[PDB]
């Protein structure tokens, strides 16, 4: 109903999010890359102006 | 092959050698790691052009985070045209299984107005979502 | 490497410096001008509440962006003085 | 057990009290189970509470006098839930007013103003205006005279507080010592030369040998009858540098520019 | 009210009130948690001594307090210190708080000692009380009857024991399709959560053995395993089963699935082995 | 007629509920359910206060009631019964949903999802008690029913955040009942209240529900200021982990207020001063916040006097709070003048008004600071000044007495002087030319870092709602 | 150091204005967002018809 | 039948309830964290897009 065979609702949310947190490591990887991109783009703003 | 690449003076032969090393170190992941480091360390563009592809094929279809990081850094950080291009195309091979993440990672490269980058960005969407279309992929290519 | 090297000021350029007269000139020019960019920005931002950005820029002289122009002038002297102190103190402490 | 302690206090024996209390600690458990712990208070529990309170109380005043400040605090702490609750039904008592006065002297003889005012706030809510300050006035006037900085007033109050012979006097002798120690931090800042007669006068002494004795212990070098407060400052400053913390404690001209630089390029 | 009485009692050196005080402090613990946290090293002093039998009670105060202070790891140490008195703290509707953190704590240790050697449950590096807590939480999933939840915590926790036993007991033939379903859920989560090569090969290879003992098994389940691991040995043994049966249709089916799915290098060694194995030329 | 007014109100409530229920069915979110909930809470309270009493009864009847109908009914009979609006078809309906709690679905019992409904019936009743504004028994009944119910099951992120707003009402009704009357049995009920608060925080700790966590902390702090357990509270504040990035600004103001009161009593007035100015800035200028502002601004004037900083004359005039801040105004003029004689008058005249604000405990400490300010006047006016002269102006008792006042005061460095015993004068030592020294450098360093931190706040905030709008279908 | 202080602070002025500006951009884009939802209702049905 | 107002049937449906907060805390912690990183990556994109 909503509290009967609750251990079967429990297993599908647990499974599904576990798969996505691997793929959500690839999105923080991206955060890390674009911290560097702006530093490379700041020297290239300088070179373009040069 | 690696050493012969420096001996040869014909450019086509270097190109051919560089990517063919990638093909031999296919499917071998973290055992190919030593080779990856020499190819990137070079001052010859062809050795870097092939360097990107070695990461792509060894870590192919497994979304290993270390592989994607190298390919990203190198794409941006080298001024040499072949070198840039090659790194971008490499991403699709790696992220073949988890193509969910590909359009959001490569939005960046299509933002930038360098042409060689942009050529490879398209190709990366081509490879990655080859199997089945992703509506987002098409939208970024328009 | 030959190409890259064009200096004997690779190690003789951070401890080496320009007199403090010249740093007093940069400080005095920089502060004095930023008042003028700041007075145009004040006339400017009596607006910024009408219709269309593009119009405001013509009529009340939003051109070149005075908001951007003040940021640039502040950033250039700000970064320069950190260097000016940074080299100054480095010499006093290491040399004696 | 219970009743043998009662008559031990009446005698004026306070060692007898202290000695006899470890049995009664067993029997205080039986008493703690008798109350429900202030979940509900009836007139059954009001009789049980009298027993309970009684054991702690007569013991607490006795600890003072035998120079067992630690035991005193322990006893005092147990009372606090009974005093909190249940007001005007054996919770505010003649005895409460007496024991709060002595407690406040005890906090004061540590020379902490932090606990004192914190405790003072607690009292506003209970007894301090119900039965008033009239015996609770002694630590509160004393606290006053040192906050403004009149040590004459404090000294005088304390001198008449040796008229009050019971257990307030056990704290008098500590607290006279405390005014001196307080004054001796002050004098470093005030003076750099004082005569030997003047150091004596200021610290409320009448014996020159006692002045010079205190000076050893308080770490002053009186050489030729003139104090050198400045020597003393030097040593005190140096020690706080000497323990590591120290590059960023000092700060460097070079280091400021480095901090600012990284923030802009991050 | 205040915890100030309770401090007084530990500070007293009559033993009876100290015993008492351990009991009373744990009654009001999640109310007077800040006050008694300051004078919690006292409570620990009584635990170290060997004059007391109320060591467990004393440990128990600290675990409840330490959570509330904000350090989760320190709680776990004192709970395993106390020994028992914690199987009534899984069935609280107000404290499962200490228990969950312990489950996480095992995973940090378990990763480290898997890579070195497969077995490490005979090692004393993992605390035994901690091992128990993991194993009983999982048993608790299998009590309501759900093997999906039991497989998930064991996979994270790097267990060969738990996963082995759950699939073994989940052969009893209540519905053939049902048992095969659980083994897929295991193959999928393995690929998608774990890409650390050692544990992945192992759990996957393990599955092959349980499928084939059943008097009916789907072979799409079986084939998935071979192709990830790339073993011609699994492939040879799979065929040798069907050569016992002499059943035409099964032998043709697996072969079509194989050629498409499997990599070129694997098929090339495989045919040479079946040829000296003996086969009907139809499969070849 | 009367029924028609409850039905028109009810349908507003149902859309807001329907709208939250879908967002939380997809995957739990915090802020998006939060924004919806905050609007609804205000409207419901205004509709229940002005209109009917059984407008709450209607909703409770209409949906499944676990016990709420019976509980509502008990309340309504005491303040004038109600038996109307009990009709069928306003009780065989379960409102309109697409199928999430639709009339056919709920009767059929393929689903039953009383969860959120339970949470909304509790908000209705909890507001109604506070709208009635009656204390006694009515308060007690409200606390009993709702609290154990919410704790038998484990709450979702959505339900937990709702229950923080329920808790408020509980504390507030109970607290006023206790301050109206002195009943000996209430002290014992306060212990039960204390226990419940801290357990609510520990449950919420596990679920990372940030608003719940912050809201509870404020109440516990209040409860200490009322009982005098300042003593406990020193402990409490050093072990908080209060949220700032994910909570309402009303909580953030309240929090800042409490700290200054507690810090001030421990004779730290430096930190006291920084914390109150922050609470004022969070708190608006409206008459909706009016009693908050009055108390906060009392404490700020008193803080600056405790420093010896002294508030300006500007402050009291530009505020329109002149009559309320009158005891503080007279204080500020008094301390400045260094008049012991005036000061004795000021705290005596105004005694009662000060004690109600519980700044009186702080105020008594100024009879001393009145003296220290006064001798500071003397050393500024006169650089070198005889011991005798000082005794004459402020009615001090001996040369020796004033020596000693000044000895304490210059340890704190107020006066910033030193006594020569051998000539008989008190000499201030300030002459500036501290531009030469390294002191300004230290100051300039601090200013920059307050600025770098402001850049960080700007960066995190600015770009974050842009990122949402792009994802959103709007171009 | 004092010139550097005024300048850091000048740059902070400039940025708090850029903070308010983008915040106005968001207030504006809110209207567009509301209007878009009612509008997308009409479009869905048409594309399915074809 | 059974309710979310309270638990119904002790140590049967409260046996199921009893194994639930162990699962949910893990991912509830993961939700709040990966929502602020997701917003953050887009923040630093926005920044390098104007540059």
Short mmCIF file of C-alpha atoms in Angstrom, two decimals, chain C:
data_model
loop_
_atom_site.label_atom_id
_atom_site.label_comp_id
_atom_site.label_asym_id
_atom_site.label_seq_id
_atom_site.Cartn_x
_atom_site.Cartn_y
_atom_site.Cartn_z
CA UNK C 1 65.50 27.15 -26.04
CA UNK C 2 67.68 29.69 -27.89
CA UNK C 3 64.60 31.31 -29.27
CA UNK C 4 62.88 31.49 -25.90
CA UNK C 5 65.89 33.00 -24.14
CA UNK C 6 66.14 36.58 -25.07
CA UNK C 7 67.08 37.77 -21.53
CA UNK C 8 69.86 37.95 -19.05
CA UNK C 9 66.93 39.16 -16.85
CA UNK C 10 65.80 35.71 -15.87
CA UNK C 11 67.00 36.02 -12.31
CA UNK C 12 67.96 39.69 -12.57
CA UNK C 13 64.46 41.15 -12.89
CA UNK C 14 62.65 40.29 -9.76
CA UNK C 15 65.18 41.54 -7.32
CA UNK C 16 66.00 44.35 -9.95
CA UNK C 17 63.51 47.25 -9.81
CA UNK C 18 62.66 50.80 -10.80
CA UNK C 19 63.14 53.71 -8.34
CA UNK C 20 60.43 54.54 -5.91
CA UNK C 21 59.91 57.88 -7.65
CA UNK C 22 58.44 56.10 -10.54
CA UNK C 23 56.24 53.98 -8.29
CA UNK C 24 55.04 57.26 -6.58
CA UNK C 25 54.12 58.56 -10.19
CA UNK C 26 52.07 55.37 -10.98
CA UNK C 27 50.30 55.56 -7.67
CA UNK C 28 49.47 59.29 -8.11
CA UNK C 29 48.37 58.95 -11.80
CA UNK C 30 46.32 55.86 -11.18
CA UNK C 31 44.32 57.30 -8.15
CA UNK C 32 43.83 60.66 -9.89
CA UNK C 33 42.28 59.20 -13.15
CA UNK C 34 39.96 56.67 -11.42
CA UNK C 35 38.11 59.71 -9.98
CA UNK C 36 37.30 60.78 -13.58
CA UNK C 37 36.09 57.34 -14.68
CA UNK C 38 34.11 57.30 -11.37
CA UNK C 39 32.36 60.73 -12.23
CA UNK C 40 31.33 59.50 -15.69
CA UNK C 41 30.00 56.28 -14.06
CA UNK C 42 27.96 58.43 -11.58
CA UNK C 43 26.24 60.48 -14.54
CA UNK C 44 25.76 57.16 -16.26
CA UNK C 45 23.97 55.21 -13.48
CA UNK C 46 21.45 58.04 -12.81
CA UNK C 47 20.01 55.97 -15.61
CA UNK C 48 20.18 52.25 -16.26
CA UNK C 49 16.39 51.93 -15.79
CA UNK C 50 14.93 53.08 -19.05
CA UNK C 51 14.18 51.10 -22.29
CA UNK C 52 16.90 49.23 -24.33
CA UNK C 53 20.62 48.96 -23.18
CA UNK C 54 21.77 50.12 -26.68
CA UNK C 55 20.00 53.41 -26.41
CA UNK C 56 21.33 54.26 -22.98
CA UNK C 57 24.86 53.70 -24.22
CA UNK C 58 24.56 56.23 -26.95
CA UNK C 59 22.71 59.09 -25.17
CA UNK C 60 24.25 59.01 -21.70
CA UNK C 61 27.60 57.62 -22.95
CA UNK C 62 27.61 53.95 -21.82
CA UNK C 63 30.15 53.47 -24.70
CA UNK C 64 33.27 51.32 -24.15
CA UNK C 65 31.53 50.46 -20.80
CA UNK C 66 32.73 52.83 -18.04
CA UNK C 67 31.92 50.00 -15.64
CA UNK C 68 34.41 47.76 -17.52
CA UNK C 69 36.93 50.70 -17.97
CA UNK C 70 37.11 51.34 -14.16
CA UNK C 71 37.62 47.62 -13.50
CA UNK C 72 40.56 47.46 -15.90
CA UNK C 73 42.26 50.59 -14.54
CA UNK C 74 41.89 49.32 -10.91
CA UNK C 75 43.09 45.79 -11.84
CA UNK C 76 46.20 46.98 -13.57
CA UNK C 77 47.51 49.18 -10.72
CA UNK C 78 46.33 46.73 -8.00
CA UNK C 79 48.29 43.87 -9.42
CA UNK C 80 51.33 46.13 -10.00
CA UNK C 81 51.57 47.36 -6.40
CA UNK C 82 51.53 43.85 -4.92
CA UNK C 83 54.60 43.26 -7.07
CA UNK C 84 56.03 46.59 -6.00
CA UNK C 85 55.90 45.81 -2.28
CA UNK C 86 56.59 42.12 -2.88
CA UNK C 87 59.97 42.85 -4.53
CA UNK C 88 60.62 45.69 -2.06
CA UNK C 89 60.39 43.59 1.08
CA UNK C 90 62.08 40.65 -0.51
CA UNK C 91 65.20 42.72 -0.93
CA UNK C 92 65.28 44.16 2.49
CA UNK C 93 64.93 40.84 4.27
CA UNK C 94 67.19 38.58 2.08
CA UNK C 95 70.06 41.03 1.19
CA UNK C 96 70.49 42.26 4.86
#
